[PDB]
Ligand binder design. Structure first.
Ligand SMILES: [Mg+2]
Ligand SMILES: [Mg+2]
Ligand SMILES: [Mg+2]
Ligand SMILES: [Mg+2]
Ligand SMILES: [Mg+2]
Ligand SMILES: [Mg+2]
Ligand SMILES: [Mg+2]
Ligand SMILES: [Zn+2]
Lengths: 95, 202, 128, 119, 70, 76, 214
RNA sequence: CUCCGCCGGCACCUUAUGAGAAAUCAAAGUCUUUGGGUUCCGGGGGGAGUAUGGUCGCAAGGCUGAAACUUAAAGGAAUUGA
């Protein structure tokens, strides 16, 4: 049986897509198949923002954010709850 | 001279924003759109709306026992319409949710064998449409320019998504039914006002 | 990649099965027109028109709603006046109606006129 | 867990429908009234049905409610549902349209139509 | 009719979309016959002005050069 | 259809769809038969109507509306 | 008794319907079996197969019996009913009532010459259910029914006398074999033959003739 | 950048009037109502891509490719349970 119509990856009109290394285990997974998330997270969470905001010398200092684009293989993404097993019908939902 | 009945209906339907469609057009509803504006919304040929209203009226009037007609609206704006339409023409209104099995389940207490079925909108009243195809029931529907036309025989093209349009269309169907039945004599004097058909928001 | 009288007849079956009233055949020929004449004379299509812009041609056919299936026997076999019977048993729904079209040195004609005029030929198609 | 089951809830509504006038908002008098109109097989069933009817009356006296059909409010929601204004708010005098609307009206031959003008 | 929107070869009777036009510059009011999809840089014999430009579609006329379909 | 001795041996010659000429079978429950009434003069209705039959094929394509529209435009 | 629950049932109880062909002409859904049992006096039923089906559960396997019942007067009406129940007798009873509800007309024809009473199928006809396809071809008179036991019983209840049958697929699946045969019979009336070319003169539907009574 | 249209691509969404054992498929449709043209290729599971002969390769190996014997199922899709 064929689980998905796209074969589990986003490849049409190509023959080959370069792979990437999983951020957790370093497994080689093609770029169009890996689970890619762009995380824009703060330098410190809100319980500890103010005791740094009061220790800023400059007025108007904005604490940077860290930006990282994290790839996961299917196994690590499933195990880390980034993606979940869905039902047959809700598998088709790309939203 | 004065205005003919067709001209007066055109005036009223144009006042009730019946002519004003939606952004999209179903291809089977394309035989009724006149043109599309820079807004993106289509304008409906009201002359063809009136012609279909005549055809629908002549189909409705030929029913020897009006209690064999079921009128129906799943939307909240079409309750008060389909009730008064049923009360002046003598048909059977059912407003709100439709109970699946009303037309195909004989052992249901809510079970009817309608000779005709009228629908505010093919999109929201899709359950009675599907149930009709199992009971040889012809159907008349008010179809916007995005209405699916599967299993609908007579479609009146109109904006069915507005408060004044639904009321004025049902008022105007009722008027022709009464005229052809002869209860309204020749001469436009009919005393029931179109404000009866718009719904009331508590 | 073209061998017409298959595209024409199959376009007609598809159009008739969808209930269309007009069908358009892009590449025409005398063979197609001669076939369509048999169709009309036996009653299965309405009148049709040749539109010549210049080229191979073009025709539009008026469908009467009474044809059920019309197809070609490509690989046109050689067909003598004695094995007409067995082709029509293999290919027609009954002994009562349906026609097999054969090209013969006496023109293109149906199998019954072929029996009467006692000529064989090569099979082109059928319709019923 | 004090969820009332089907029998109590059904009987509560169905006794609200039959006698709205003779019930009231006190539990105890409602107990007595419910003892004077229906045949129940336990005191606990009566106390439970009367308890569910008393706050059903509190919310009825508050506003509207589901399936129970009270007569004094089904006609009052009809007496004002066949309600008419002084004259019809849909008027054909000032009905302004945009280019393509008079374009279609010229298509039909009703190019001159009393009360139509551009935006 | 909506054939004018259809493809050049998919009409009931096939027809071209191009035209020959009578073009007129400013410094020499003679009239030159040129083809809507030129493919060549063309100069009028008298005035020696560059007259149109080859593109991927219809040729681009130069500044202030009237033309008439004909 | 007809026996060779003149007799008619079929039972129940079926109706045919007025748009596509397909047969409306006994078990085709998506077909309908419309009777549209004739308005003549004062009163504007007597028991005079013209009848059109539509099979489940047409009704399921959606083309019932266009077909009915075009079949009502016949003048008498 | 009956006390019918449908307009057709009422009209049949008052006796304003004599055969089933005025219900066939209008494609009406027949929802009560008594409508058949009045309009068809001599309808014969027969059980063709009883099949046990099972569903697996934690406690064990729950068995149910499915019955296949062909009914028909041998004069051009057949019906097929299938019913699953916990007990063979009630499965059979439900299968009879469903088979009566499913009664369909079958048109008969002549192989070569229109002498006498019609004996074969009019023309080549096919039917499919699942993987099973059944073909029925006109046969000369007196040639018998060349078919396996299942389609032979179905055709016998149809009143067809001579026919050449061919089949393909898993005919050992009796369910699909019998339903393919029934489906083949039911579409003998859906083929457009030149004797059906005559334009139709429509008749008022039974809901519309008997308007005043209802 | 916005709107409309026509060719040509990679695809996608909704739907049977279709097909299919189904999963599914707008081509896997236009098939017992079976025929547009053409090339390759299958015939229960194993034995076995094995033995042997030929051929190509430095080699690893590639292509071509059996038989004896054995066996009543192996297998596909879907359902209910565990
Ligand atoms: Mg798996
Ligand atoms: Mg490419
Ligand atoms: Mg690769
Ligand atoms: Mg494109
Ligand atoms: Mg074999
Ligand atoms: Mg083998
Ligand atoms: Mg499996
Ligand atoms: Zn990983």
């Amino acid at each position: 049986t064929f689980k998905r119509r796209n074969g589990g990856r986003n490849k049409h009109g190509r023959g080959h897509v370069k792979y990437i290394r999983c951020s957790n285990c370093a497994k080689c997974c093609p770029k169009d198949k890996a689970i890619k998330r762009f995380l824009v997270r703060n330098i410190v969470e809100q319980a500890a923002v103010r005791d740094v905001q009061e220790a800023c010398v400059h007025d108007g200092y904005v604490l940077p954010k860290l930006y990282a684009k994290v790839h996961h293989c299917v196994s690590c993404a499933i195990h880390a709850h980034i993606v979940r097993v869905r039902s047959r019908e809700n598998r088709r939902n790309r939203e | 001279r004065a205005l003919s009945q067709k001209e007066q209906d055109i005036q009223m339907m144009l006042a009730a924003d019946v002519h004003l469609g939606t952004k999209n057009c179903d291809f089977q509803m394309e035989r009724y759109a006149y043109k599309r504006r820079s807004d993106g919304i289509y304008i409906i040929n009201l002359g063809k709306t009136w012609e279909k209203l005549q055809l629908a009226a002549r189909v409705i009037v030929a029913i020897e026992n009006p209690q064999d007609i079921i009128v129906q609206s799943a939307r909240p704006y079409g309750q008060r319409a389909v009730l008064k339409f049923a009360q002046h023409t003598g048909a059977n209104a059912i407003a709100g949710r439709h109970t699946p099995g009303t037309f195909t389940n004989q052992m249901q207490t809510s079970f009817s064998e309608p000779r005709l079925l009228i629908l505010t909108d093919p999109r929201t009243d899709h359950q009675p449409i599907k149930e009709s195809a199992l009971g040889n029931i012809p159907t008349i529907a008010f179809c916007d320019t995005d209405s699916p036309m599967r299993y609908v025989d007579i479609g009146i093209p109109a904006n069915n998504k507005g408060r004044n349009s639904i009321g004025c269309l049902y008022w105007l169907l009722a008027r022709m039914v009464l005229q052809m039945r002869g209860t309204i004599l020749p001469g436009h004097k009919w005393d029931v006002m179109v404000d009866l058909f718009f719904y009331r928001d508590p | 990649g073209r061998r017409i009288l298959n595209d024409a007849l199959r376009t007609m079956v598809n159009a008739e099965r969808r209930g269309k009233a007009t069908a358009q055949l892009q590449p025409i020929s005398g063979v197609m027109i001669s076939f369509l004449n048999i169709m009309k004379h036996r009653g299965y299509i309405k009148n049709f028109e040749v539109f010549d812009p210049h080229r191979v041609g073009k025709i539009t056919v008026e469908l009467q709603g009474r044809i059920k299936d019309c197809k070609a026997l490509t690989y046109r076999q050689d067909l003598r006046a004695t094995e007409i019977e067995k082709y029509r048993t293999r290919m027609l729904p009954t002994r009562q109606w349906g026609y097999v079209v054969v090209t013969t040195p006496n023109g293109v004609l149906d199998h019954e006129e072929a029996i009467r005029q006692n000529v064989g030929g090569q099979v082109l198609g059928y319709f019923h | 867990g004090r969820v009332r089951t089907k029998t109590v809830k059904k009987t509560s509504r169905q006794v609200i429908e039959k006698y709205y006038s003779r019930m009231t908002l006190d539990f105890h008098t409602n107990k007595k009234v419910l003892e004077e109109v229906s045949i129940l097989q336990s005191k606990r069933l009566r106390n439970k049905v009367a308890g569910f009817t008393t706050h059903l009356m509190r919310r009825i006296q508050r506003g509207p409610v589901r399936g129970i059909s009270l007569k004094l409010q089904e006609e009052e929601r009809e007496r004002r549902m066949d309600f008419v204004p002084e004259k019809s708010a849909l008027e054909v005098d000032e009905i302004r349209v945009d280019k393509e609307t008079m374009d279609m009206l010229a298509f039909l031959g009703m190019a001159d139509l009393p009360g139509v003008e551009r935006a | 009719e909506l054939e004018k929107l259809k493809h050049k070869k998919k009409r009931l009777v096939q027809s071209p979309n191009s035209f020959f036009m009578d073009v007129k510059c400013q410094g020499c009011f003679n009239i030159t016959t040129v083809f809507s999809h030129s493919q060549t840089v063309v100069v009028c014999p008298g005035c020696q002005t560059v007259l149109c430009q080859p593109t991927g579609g219809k040729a681009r006329l130069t500044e202030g050069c009237s033309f008439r379909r004909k | 259809m007809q026996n060779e001795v003149g007799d008619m041996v079929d039972l129940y010659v079926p109706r045919k769809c007025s748009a596509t000429n397909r047969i409306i079978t006994a078990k085709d429950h998506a077909s309908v038969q419309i009777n549209i009434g004739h308005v003549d003069e004062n009163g504007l209705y007597d028991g005079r109507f013209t009848t059109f039959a539509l099979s489940g094929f047409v009704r399921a394509q959606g083309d019932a509306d266009g077909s009915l529209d075009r079949l009502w435009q016949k003048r008498k | 008794k009956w006390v019918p629950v449908t307009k057709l049932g009422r009209l049949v109880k008052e006796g304003r319907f004599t055969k089933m062909e005025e219900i066939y002409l209008h494609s009406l859904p027949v929802k009560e079996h008594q409508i058949v049992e009045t309009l068809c006096p001599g309808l014969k039923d027969e059980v063709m197969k009883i099949t046990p089906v099972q569903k697996q559960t934690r406690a064990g396997q729950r068995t149910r019996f499915k019955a296949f019942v062909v009914v028909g007067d041998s004069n051009g009406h057949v019906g097929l009913g299938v019913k699953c129940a916990k007990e063979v007798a009630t499965a059979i009873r439900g299968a009879i009532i469903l088979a009566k509800l499913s009664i369909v007309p079958v048109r008969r024809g002549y192989w070569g010459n229109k002498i006498g009473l019609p004996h074969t199928v009019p023309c080549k006809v096919t039917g499919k259910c699942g993987s099973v396809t059944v073909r029925m071809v006109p046969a000369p008179r007196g040639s018998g029914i060349v078919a396996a036991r299942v389609p032979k019983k179905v055709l016998q209840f149809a009143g067809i006398d001579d026919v050449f049958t061919s089949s393909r697929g898993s005919t050992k699946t009796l369910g699909n074999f019998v339903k393919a045969t029934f489906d083949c019979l039911m579409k003998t009336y859906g083929f457009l033959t030149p004797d059906f070319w005559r334009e139709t003169t429509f008749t008022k539907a039974p809901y519309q003739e008997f308007t005043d009574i209802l």
